[PDB]
Amino acid sequence: TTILAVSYNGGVVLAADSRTSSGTYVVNRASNKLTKLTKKIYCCRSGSAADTQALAERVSNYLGSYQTDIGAGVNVATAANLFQKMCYMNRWNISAGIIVAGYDPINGGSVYSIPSGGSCVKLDYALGGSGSIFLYSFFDANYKPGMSKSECVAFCQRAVAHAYSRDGSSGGLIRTITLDADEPEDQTIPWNRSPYCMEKDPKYVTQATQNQPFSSSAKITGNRMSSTG
Amino acid sequence: AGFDKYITVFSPEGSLYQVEYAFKAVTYPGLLTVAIRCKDAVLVVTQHLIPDRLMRPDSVTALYEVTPNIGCCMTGRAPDGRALVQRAREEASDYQYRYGVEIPIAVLAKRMGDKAQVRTQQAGLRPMGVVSTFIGMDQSDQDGSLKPQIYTVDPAGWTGGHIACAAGKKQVEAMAFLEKRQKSTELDALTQKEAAMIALAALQSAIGTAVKAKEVEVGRCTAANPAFQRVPNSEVEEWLTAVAE
């Protein structure tokens, strides 16, 4: 699982892979890990699918009633607090890493990370899942804060592609959603149109020289790909 | 055997006095509401009069949102209805968390009537002296289209749909006007403008004062926009001018 959220000037972009895997078999290759909480607030879920689904459904139910009670919109901080409380009271029984990202008219675009421990950190960008470990040095080198909306979406897709190119537990479709003062816009790009994969990378085209032909010299001359040669 | 009217026990005539008295608490405040449904929308108009000029007019209202797609109007003891609104909202939320779909308006009205009936059989509980009017859109089967729906809940727990209804002070005159207008036209085939004009005409004829726009508040659900929302004062003004012909 690879999930991330990046804030730009207007709002936020949430990106995720689509792969639910039972260890080494792909149970689902078209999952949707970007779960709607309110109209402008979403969460990226990593870990136990049942636990994260139940947590998201409960938080969405709580937030929907709260809008009717107060008669106004909900800030991203409220949803972040709801997840933080619900994950902290159940931290020993659930396996969940949550990213709460959204737009509210008061604080603009917000991104919150709630790891397995149950804390809540407000960040410019957040990463999560097994494939997030591959992206940290990718963000330290290639990520510049202050990108435009389209630039942020493209960077998020490229980061997700780079993450699941190396992570066996991640892969499949790349799903992104943009949340800002305008209408939220989703996008799903397939693997065959992904911004990066090692199969299309020209520097991994040449195979490692492992199957030496039987030769009278120590000179390495490529792999043996024929019986005669 | 002497009182028989201070608690929910049967009278010798087989009637509940504490529930009949709660019906008089509906018309006690002197307010009136009229709900109508056209071919593609449902409207509710409630008297919103503020004699105290020091009172913030937009703070007090009788129109409530139960769910984004279900709106409510309360007529009677103002706090009491508020309480019921809370219950209704809870009855929605739990339902949403139990079945994953939004509660139907008829189901919500039936459950609210069930809640009212309990207070008419338990001794210590006082009935809510309000009449609840839920308006919304219903998702039909075999065609997928939406239809306007009005459902009223009485303090006795009686739940019923309506093509058009009135509740409050001088509700009988409003109902008579609506029935007289129904003998000529067909309400379920009219448009939103005609239905709004009919509802405002009935409200005016019941009270005979030629209400302005600031004196009423209107809630609306439409087939194009299923969400419940309040009509802006400009549209109410143009409706009233159309009625004034």
Side-chain angles (χ1 to χ4, degrees), chain A residues 21 34 87:
Chain A
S21 62
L34 309 176
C87 292

Side-chain angles (χ1 to χ4, degrees), chain B residues 5-38:
Chain B
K5 71 182 47 183
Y6 304 145
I7 62 170
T8 44
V9 291
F10 287 98
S11 67
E13 291 69 68
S15 67
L16 301 165
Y17 273 115
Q18 274 299 297
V19 192
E20 283 154 8
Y21 293 168
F23 267 111
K24 281 200 179 175
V26 177
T27 69
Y28 184 73
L31 277 296
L32 172 70
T33 187
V34 181
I36 199 174
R37 73 184 194 183
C38 58

Side-chain angles (χ1 to χ4, degrees), chain A residues 11 27 56 90 116 129 162 175 205:
Chain A
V27 173
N90 291 304
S116 75
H162 270 278
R175 298 197 197 273
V205 163

Side-chain angles (χ1 to χ4, degrees), chain A:
Chain A
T1 292
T2 295
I3 60 177
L4 63 94
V6 182
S7 298
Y8 62 95
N9 192 279
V12 295
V13 183
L14 290 85
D17 68 336
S18 84
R19 184 180 262 197
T20 316
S21 62
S22 64
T24 52
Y25 171 76
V26 175
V27 173
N28 194 6
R29 71 171 168 109
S31 298
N32 199 332
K33 303 163 184 189
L34 309 176
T35 301
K36 184 177 180 180
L37 307 177
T38 71
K39 198 215 180 152
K40 297 300 185 59
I41 306 171
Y42 276 61
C43 65
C44 317
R45 301 174 299 106
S46 70
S48 173
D51 286 308
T52 52
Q53 280 179 19
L55 280 168
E57 293 179 353
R58 184 77 264 184
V59 165
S60 182
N61 191 267
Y62 280 165
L63 290 169
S65 290
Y66 178 78
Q67 293 179 356
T68 301
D69 187 35
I70 71 169
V74 179
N75 302 326
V76 190
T78 289
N81 204 46
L82 275 191
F83 282 99
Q84 185 204 15
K85 181 69 176 177
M86 273 175 49
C87 292
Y88 185 82
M89 305 312 282
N90 291 304
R91 55 197 194 278
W92 305 126
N93 317 118
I94 73 184
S95 167
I98 305 301
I99 290 172
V100 167
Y103 173 83
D104 68 78
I106 297 89
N107 291 300
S110 295
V111 169
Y112 290 86
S113 182
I114 303 142
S116 75
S119 52
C120 188
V121 186
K122 191 178 154 46
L123 305 149
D124 175 300
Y125 73 90
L127 317 170
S130 57
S132 64
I133 198 69
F134 302 109
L135 283 191
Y136 279 101
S137 69
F138 184 87
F139 270 71
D140 298 337
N142 303 100
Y143 169 76
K144 280 73 176 175
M147 294 184 275
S148 70
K149 182 166 137 177
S150 50
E151 279 173 21
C152 189
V153 177
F155 186 86
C156 289
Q157 293 162 333
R158 191 188 160 216
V160 161
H162 270 278
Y164 68 78
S165 288
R166 288 294 178 172
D167 188 31
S169 291
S170 301
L173 305 166
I174 305 174
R175 298 197 197 273
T176 50
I177 188 179
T178 293
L179 304 168
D180 51 5
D182 316 317
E183 205 68 357
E185 51 194 56
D186 62 358
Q187 193 163 330
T188 305
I189 57 177
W191 182 85
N192 49 11
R193 288 204 277 111
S194 61
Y196 177 81
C197 66
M198 296 181 294
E199 292 90 330
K200 310 301 173 46
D201 198 354
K203 65 178 177 290
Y204 302 115
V205 163
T206 297
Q207 272 184 326
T209 314
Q210 298 293 110
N211 312 330
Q212 296 294 141
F214 195 48
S215 79
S216 289
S217 189
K219 180 67 174 66
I220 293 162
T221 56
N223 288 309
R224 182 190 174 211
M225 293 177 71
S226 200
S227 281
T228 59

Side-chain angles (χ1 to χ4, degrees), chain B residues 121-174:
Chain B
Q121 204 155 18
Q122 183 62 255
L125 319 167
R126 191 189 101 229
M128 299 280 100
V130 297
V131 164
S132 307
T133 304
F134 304 93
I135 76 161
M137 303 302 291
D138 171 63
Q139 172 81 33
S140 162
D141 297 342
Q142 80 257 9
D143 57 88
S145 58
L146 302 182
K147 309 265 157 282
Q149 293 284 316
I150 313 184
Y151 277 90
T152 54
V153 184
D154 275 346
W158 172 257
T159 290
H162 297 273
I163 298 172
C165 63
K169 176 84 183 319
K170 314 201 77 54
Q171 66 185 62
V172 177
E173 288 77 11

Side-chain angles (χ1 to χ4, degrees), chain B:
Chain B
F3 38 95
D4 80 4
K5 71 182 47 183
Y6 304 145
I7 62 170
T8 44
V9 291
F10 287 98
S11 67
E13 291 69 68
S15 67
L16 301 165
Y17 273 115
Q18 274 299 297
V19 192
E20 283 154 8
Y21 293 168
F23 267 111
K24 281 200 179 175
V26 177
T27 69
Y28 184 73
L31 277 296
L32 172 70
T33 187
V34 181
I36 199 174
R37 73 184 194 183
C38 58
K39 79 166 46 70
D40 63 289
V42 56
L43 303 151
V44 61
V45 55
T46 300
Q47 266 199 349
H48 171 276
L49 61 83
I50 318 295
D52 189 2
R53 65 181 294 275
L54 292 185
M55 175 175 299
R56 204 154 157 160
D58 59 354
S59 65
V60 297
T61 182
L63 294 182
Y64 306 90
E65 175 188 358
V66 178
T67 68
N69 275 33
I70 299 173
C72 186
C73 172
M74 289 284 164
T75 308
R77 202 168 165 90
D80 275 13
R82 178 78 202 196
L84 288 184
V85 165
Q86 296 312 293
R87 319 274 70 79
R89 287 171 171 169
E90 287 150 15
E91 196 53 281
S93 310
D94 307 347
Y95 190 101
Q96 164 67 40
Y97 187 84
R98 189 180 318 275
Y99 307 96
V101 300
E102 183 178 1
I103 187 167
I105 181 171
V107 182
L108 173 74
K110 179 244 170 178
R111 276 159 189 233
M112 292 312 292
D114 273 320
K115 296 188 200 319
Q117 194 272 349
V118 158
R119 307 187 69 81
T120 69
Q121 204 155 18
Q122 183 62 255
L125 319 167
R126 191 189 101 229
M128 299 280 100
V130 297
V131 164
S132 307
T133 304
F134 304 93
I135 76 161
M137 303 302 291
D138 171 63
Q139 172 81 33
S140 162
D141 297 342
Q142 80 257 9
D143 57 88
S145 58
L146 302 182
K147 309 265 157 282
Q149 293 284 316
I150 313 184
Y151 277 90
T152 54
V153 184
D154 275 346
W158 172 257
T159 290
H162 297 273
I163 298 172
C165 63
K169 176 84 183 319
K170 314 201 77 54
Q171 66 185 62
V172 177
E173 288 77 11
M175 291 302 300
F177 187 96
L178 292 163
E179 288 152 26
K180 179 174 71 68
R181 186 63 60 86
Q182 191 201 15
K183 296 184 189 296
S184 61
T185 63
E186 209 280 332
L187 275 67
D188 274 346
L190 301 173
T191 76
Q192 173 181 172
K193 179 182 174 66
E194 293 146 347
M197 288 188 285
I198 289 186
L200 297 158
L203 197 148
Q204 285 193 350
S205 84
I207 79 182
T209 65
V211 298
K212 271 75 68 179
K214 306 182 321 301
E215 294 179 355
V216 290
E217 48 190 342
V218 185
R220 168 175 52 195
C221 298
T222 68
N225 189 28
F228 172 80
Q229 44 199 72
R230 54 184 69 220
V231 184
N233 293 71
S234 61
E235 193 164 2
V236 188
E237 277 145 7
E238 79 187 4
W239 281 342
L240 284 168
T241 67
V243 176
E245 61 87 18

